[PDB]
């Protein structure tokens, strides 16, 4: 709960540009909202996928490395606390984010749309 708020604070601190400059790049990622007792393996998959998305060479180029490490640490901290169709829907959701980023050639506006999208879907998953 407190580690969830620190993840959102670091994602907001990672912001480089305003999404107002990228409104034409908005996209519906179709997050399966009503997936959040058996919430542990779904939330666990969500955190791992967020880590996977934000730990590629592309993410290293697009974001401040210092904030990215505190961000991985916070995602890891949440996995410590926690420790199949739902997992698949989450995996499909992150595939759509990756496909969008590839199609948009990892532009700063595509990255800002994805950062703001993760701000929403992460806060939804963590209530």
């Amino acid at each position, epitope marked *: 709960s407190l580690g969830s708020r620190r993840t959102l604070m670091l994602l907001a601190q990672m912001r480089r540009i*305003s999404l107002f400059s990228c409104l034409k790049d908005r996209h*519906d990622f179709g997050f399966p909202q009503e997936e959040f007792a058996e919430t542990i393996p779904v939330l666990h998959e969500m955190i791992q996928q967020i880590f996977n998305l934000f730990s590629t060479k592309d993410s290293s180029a697009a974001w401040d490395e210092t904030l990215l490490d505190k961000f991985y640490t916070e995602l890891y901290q949440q996995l410590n606390d926690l420790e199949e169709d739902s997992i698949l829907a989450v995996r499909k959701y992150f595939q759509r984010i990756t496909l969008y980023l590839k199609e948009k050639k990892y532009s700063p506006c595509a990255w800002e749309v994805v950062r703001a999208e993760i701000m929403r879907s992460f806060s939804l998953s963590t209530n």
Partner: single-chain antibody
Amino acid sequence: EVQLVESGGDLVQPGGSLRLSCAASGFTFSGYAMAWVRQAPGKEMQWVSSISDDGGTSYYADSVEGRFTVSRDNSRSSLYLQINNLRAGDTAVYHCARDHGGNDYGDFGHFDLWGRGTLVTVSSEIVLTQSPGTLSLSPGEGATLSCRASQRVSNNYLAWYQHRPGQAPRLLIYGASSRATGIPDRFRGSGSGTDFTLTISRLEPEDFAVYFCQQYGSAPPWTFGQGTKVEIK
């Protein structure tokens, strides 16, 4: 006492031009993205143009692209809309509005402050559907207003507004269920996907107004419902 005041509306010939102006008071104008939303007689609200806090970035509806030009003077707390090559479709009350979106979530496209508008009379997309058209109720009664979208509203970015006679439109709900600052608990937003509802649990005399919905999840244009009029009995 915080307001937006539009002026510059007039009778104008087809092919003519008008400069609309919007004066902002009670807030530091320079910190907000701004917008122009018009309403033709008998029609739903229509987003026209948006402009960034610094004026460097702007957006337009496709029908006004190249004919309209939005600008702003932050040192004067003024927003402008130059409207050229006017046609019969441009006859509308033009409202200026203050964007309620923030940078942390990037939830731009919805408005927490509006002006009463300035009439322009030219002398001769996701569709939202509201139901019912009119509700005739007595004070103390509840009301259930529906807003249906032609496709899924991305991120649940649905806003509800109240338009009381003689008053500027007012933001009630944003993000489909968050009450705006100052809005009483009797207004309750719910829903997701393509089906949204506004519940007014007890009607007060000031609650007799037109209530309209808006989706702002998409890339521009952001679109509005035609409204549900709630009248007294």
